């Protein structure tokens, strides 16, 4: 079964927990060693640790590196949940295909932003 | 031809199995479950729901 | 260190047999066996943790 | 004859979300097995009482033999939960069901009662030995055994049990062997 | 017949982990240090002899002190019994214990059982 | 079950290991692997020789049951096995199945 290091799910788990602690308002760039540290999983073995760092976070097609620290790649815009009219305001792509799946869980259910979003220009159709 | 049995013998056998072991248990420990869940995926890209 | 390297090299020698075996699966079986223990280990960890807390 | 109360089932809302696993590990006399049931069963020795403490904060208390004893036992269960440290409130200690038992002291003919009172009384020998006389005006289900012990169940307040006994007393005397 | 079992188990365990130590990386000297460290602690304790050693709805507080002392339960020297349970059933106030594979340390002595049956009122 | 580690046998082992870890004579991770081996061994060793058994009688106090483990604290009771009397003013009983 190809190459396996330590316990399965370290990747699909490291990214996610990050995909979680950052949304939970703990926003700040980190490293795989820092994630093992904070998760108390540092003893994953240097080999696996290394393989995760060099390869797991290289084979990821959307992982963002400026340099040292990996960053979220799902949304270009910070998950503010507010003031998108400029994006919304732009009239060159008929609203730029807004995604509901990306929306929700930044710090509130959309049903709160939308109501203000309903109050404001933001119009959403669940076709 | 017709006897007087109270609990059908077949029914009594299933009862012990269901009482002894419950197929689905606690709806708890979300973090713990994910690991169990991630591990299966390593072996296969596809598993049926059951 | 070169003796250790030689030992590692033997590893690749026997991984050749592994391919021939697959060509003919022991490694796969071992991996499957390792997968099964994980759940039992976790169960022991919870109950064991509870016992430790108790005493 | 005066019936004597044997069980008070009471329900009281603690007012807040409780983590069941934490309660089981620290509280004494506590069992919380998720597979069989979803609640912590907690038992106290001073007033006999077995209480299921539910996860969402609703508590049901059973085994107390009088009204004051049940309220006191529920308060004791709430205070044990508080000393752990979860925020605790006491709301709506309301009695749900009270079971009472008494003996008429004379032998009774169940078969005869079914003949003249088929509308309110149902009796089958194989399923159970005793006739059930569900009574509508005071809502109570009374089980009468042949020996003469009558068990009254399903009463909101102490009174209801006493009035149902008055009515059943003479009707049984007519069917007394 | 107890020191014997312990020797038996220590031997088996030591023999069975040798390869792991080797595979993991470790000189056989470390293994022997383990055995020595291990045997020595028991001798120091002196619990028995060993061959190696020889070599209103709110004022709730208006009803408090019902609970007894939790700290009484732990002494750290309390007779500790490690065993497995088959079924434990209590009816009314009767508690029945159906236990197995247990190692007991009562009054300082060590005992073992394949099965233990007990009764207690709470 | 890492149940039997805090026993005379199990603790003497851990202490011995910590030393070796302390002197870098022996190190961790490997230590974990050794403990894992111990768990398998003590479980298997317990169900071996057998041929022993004990009826006891008692007066309880606290009880606890979690996912799969009873912990009692029976007190002021005497247990007699094979005409031998054991007197305990406080006894803690743990069963983990």
């Amino acid at each position: 079964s190809g190459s396996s290091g330590y316990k399965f799910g370290v990747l699909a788990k490291i990214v996610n927990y990050m995909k979680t602690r950052h949304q939970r308002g703990d926003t700040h760039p980190l490293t795989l060693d820092e994630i093992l540290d904070e998760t108390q999983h540092l003893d994953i073995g240097l080999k696996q640790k290394q393989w995760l760092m060099t390869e797991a976070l290289v084979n990821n097609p959307k992982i963002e590196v400026i340099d040292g620290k990996y960053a979220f790649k799902p949304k270009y815009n910070v998950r503010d949940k507010k003031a998108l009219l400029r994006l919304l305001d732009q009239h060159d792509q008929r609203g730029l295909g807004g995604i509901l799946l990306e929306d929700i869980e930044e710090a509130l259910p959309n049903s709160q932003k939308a109501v203000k979003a309903l109050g404001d220009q933001i119009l959403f159709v669940n076709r | 031809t017709n006897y007087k049995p109270v609990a059908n013998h077949q029914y009594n056998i299933e009862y012990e199995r269901k009482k002894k072991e419950d197929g689905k248990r606690a709806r708890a420990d979300k973090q713990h479950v994910l690991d169990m869940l991630f591990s299966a995926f390593e072996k296969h890209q596809y598993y049926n729901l059951k | 260190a070169q003796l250790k390297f030689f030992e590692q090299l033997d590893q690749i020698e026997k991984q050749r047999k592994d391919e021939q075996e697959r060509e003919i699966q022991l490694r796969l079986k071992q991996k499957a066996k390792e997968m099964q223990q994980q759940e039992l280990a976790q169960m022991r960890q919870r109950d064991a943790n509870l016992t430790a807390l108790a005493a | 004859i005066v019936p004597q109360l044997q069980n008070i089932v009471s329900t009281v809302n603690l007012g807040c979300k409780l983590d069941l696993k934490t309660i089981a590990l620290r509280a004494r006399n506590a069992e919380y097995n998720p597979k069989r049931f979803a609640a912590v069963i907690m038992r106290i020795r001073e007033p006999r009482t077995t209480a299921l403490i539910f996860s969402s904060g609703k508590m049901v208390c059973t085994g107390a033999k009088s009204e004051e004893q049940s309220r006191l036992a529920a308060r004791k269960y709430a205070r044990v939960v508080q000393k752990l440290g979860f925020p605790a409130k006491f709301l709506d200690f309301k009695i749900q069901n009270m079971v009472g038992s008494c003996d008429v002291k004379f032998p009774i003919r169940l078969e005869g009662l079914v003949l003249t009172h088929q509308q309110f009384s149902s009796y089958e020998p194989e399923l159970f030995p005793g006739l059930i006389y569900r009574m509508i005006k005071p809502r109570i289900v009374l089980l009468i055994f042949v020996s003469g012990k009558v068990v009254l169940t399903g009463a909101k307040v102490r009174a209801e049990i006493y009035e149902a006994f008055e009515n059943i007393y003479p009707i049984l005397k007519g069917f007394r062997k | 017949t107890v020191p014997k079992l312990y020797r038996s188990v220590i031997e088996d365990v030591i023999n069975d982990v040798r390869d792991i130590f080797l595979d993991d990386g470790v000189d056989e000297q470390v293994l022997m240090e383990l055995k020595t460290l291990w045997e020595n602690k028991l001798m120091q304790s002196r619990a028995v002899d060993g061959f190696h050693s020889e070599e209103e709805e709110e004022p709730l507080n208006s009803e408090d002190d019902v609970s007894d002392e939790e700290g009484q339960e732990l002494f750290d020297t309390e007779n500790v019994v490690v065993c497995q349970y088959d079924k434990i059933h209590r009816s009314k106030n009767k508690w029945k214990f159906h236990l197995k594979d247990g190692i007991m340390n009562l009054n300082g002595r060590d005992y073992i059982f394949s099965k233990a049956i007990g009764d207690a009122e709470w | 079950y890492q149940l039997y580690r805090n026993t005379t046998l199990g603790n003497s082992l851990q202490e011995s290991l910590d030393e070796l870890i302390q002197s870098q004579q022996i190190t961790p991770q490997l230590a974990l692997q050794v403990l894992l081996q111990f768990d398998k061994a003590i479980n298997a060793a317990l169900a071996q020789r057998v041929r022993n058994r004990v009826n006891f009688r008692g007066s309880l106090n606290t009880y606890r049951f979690c996912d799969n483990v009873w912990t009692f604290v029976l007190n002021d009771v005497e247990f007699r096995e094979v005409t031998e009397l054991i007197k305990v003013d406080k006894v803690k009983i743990v069963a983990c199945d």
Side-chain angles (χ1 to χ4, degrees), chain A:
Chain A
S1 64
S3 62
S4 60
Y6 220 84
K7 303 296 182 180
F8 305 90
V10 154
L11 179 55
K13 174 177 174 177
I14 289 166
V15 171
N16 195 17
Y17 153 81
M18 203 202 317
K19 181 189 176 57
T20 303
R21 67 160 266 309
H22 177 100
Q23 296 298 0
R24 185 171 48 88
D26 312 34
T27 74
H28 78 236
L30 37 49
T31 61
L32 188 106
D33 167 27
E34 176 172 341
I35 298 154
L36 291 187
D37 204 348
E38 293 178 355
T39 56
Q40 307 188 326
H41 294 347
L42 191 60
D43 196 13
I44 198 162
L46 297 181
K47 306 177 182 122
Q48 293 71 9
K49 188 172 185 180
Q50 188 58 63
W51 182 84
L52 291 166
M53 186 64 181
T54 60
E55 180 180 4
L57 298 176
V58 182
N59 184 25
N60 190 327
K62 293 187 185 173
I63 194 69
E64 179 70 345
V65 141
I66 302 301
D67 199 1
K69 289 182 182 298
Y70 304 104
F72 294 81
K73 179 62 173 171
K75 193 56 173 297
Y76 324 78
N77 185 1
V78 56
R79 286 284 303 269
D80 174 20
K81 64 179 180 180
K82 286 179 60 180
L84 181 56
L85 180 58
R86 177 60 62 269
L87 183 175
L88 183 57
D89 184 9
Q90 274 180 2
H91 269 115
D92 248 342
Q93 42 227 252
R94 184 219 133 206
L96 200 261
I99 303 263
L100 184 147
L101 172 54
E102 283 179 328
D103 195 333
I104 303 177
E105 112 184 16
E106 37 224 325
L108 93 187
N110 186 14
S111 302
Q112 191 203 342
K113 163 173 54 170
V115 167
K116 300 180 181 179
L118 181 58
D120 219 0
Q121 293 177 335
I122 319 194
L123 284 154
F124 27 92
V125 61
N126 293 222
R127 176 343 72 169

Side-chain angles (χ1 to χ4, degrees), chain F residues 20-47 50 52-78:
Chain F
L20 297 176
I21 295 162
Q22 207 265 277
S23 67
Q24 282 73 65
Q25 248 169 311
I26 68 177
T27 57
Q29 179 47 226
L30 184 58
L32 176 62
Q33 292 295 347
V34 180
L35 288 167
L36 288 181
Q37 192 56 50
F38 167 75
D39 296 327
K40 304 190 181 191
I42 185 59
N43 298 348
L46 300 177
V50 292
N52 180 182
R53 32 213 348 285
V54 311
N55 67 156
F56 54 107
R57 70 255 46 182
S59 57
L60 227 134
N61 183 7
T62 60
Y63 64 75
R64 174 188 285 85
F65 181 70
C66 220
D67 177 312
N68 266 316
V69 50
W70 283 97
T71 299
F72 308 105
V73 169
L74 300 178
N75 307 134
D76 300 332
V77 269
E78 48 284 336

Side-chain angles (χ1 to χ4, degrees), chain D residues 24-97:
Chain D
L25 293 173
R26 316 163 56 191
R28 292 178 154 198
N29 308 339
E31 321 171 3
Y32 160 54
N33 187 201
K35 58 174 196 298
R36 293 182 183 174
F37 198 51
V40 166
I41 280 75
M42 185 161 308
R43 298 188 179 88
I44 67 185
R45 291 193 297 274
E46 164 56 13
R48 192 152 299 283
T49 13
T50 289
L52 328 182
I53 309 183
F54 261 88
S55 50
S56 92
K58 293 190 186 60
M59 185 162 58
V60 184
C61 143
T62 76
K65 295 201 178 302
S66 100
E67 289 81 315
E68 205 49 20
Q69 285 203 13
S70 165
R71 170 183 198 72
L72 175 51
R75 284 284 190 173
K76 288 182 168 172
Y77 277 114
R79 185 226 318 92
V80 162
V81 160
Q82 184 199 50
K83 285 171 179 175
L84 298 171
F86 306 72
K89 273 158 286 299
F90 204 88
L91 308 160
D92 314 11
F93 158 80
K94 176 179 182 180
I95 296 86
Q96 300 302 358
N97 170 26

Side-chain angles (χ1 to χ4, degrees), chain E residues 11-42:
Chain E
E11 294 305 352
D12 295 348
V13 178
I14 297 302
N15 285 326
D16 280 300
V17 302
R18 185 159 275 120
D19 292 336
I20 306 182
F21 271 54
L22 296 174
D23 299 2
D24 300 356
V26 120
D27 194 303
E28 177 143 18
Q29 288 200 308
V30 186
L31 181 64
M32 302 313 285
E33 295 302 320
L34 180 61
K35 184 181 208 209
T36 299
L37 286 175
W38 190 5
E39 306 183 328
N40 299 1
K41 299 296 183 181
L42 301 179

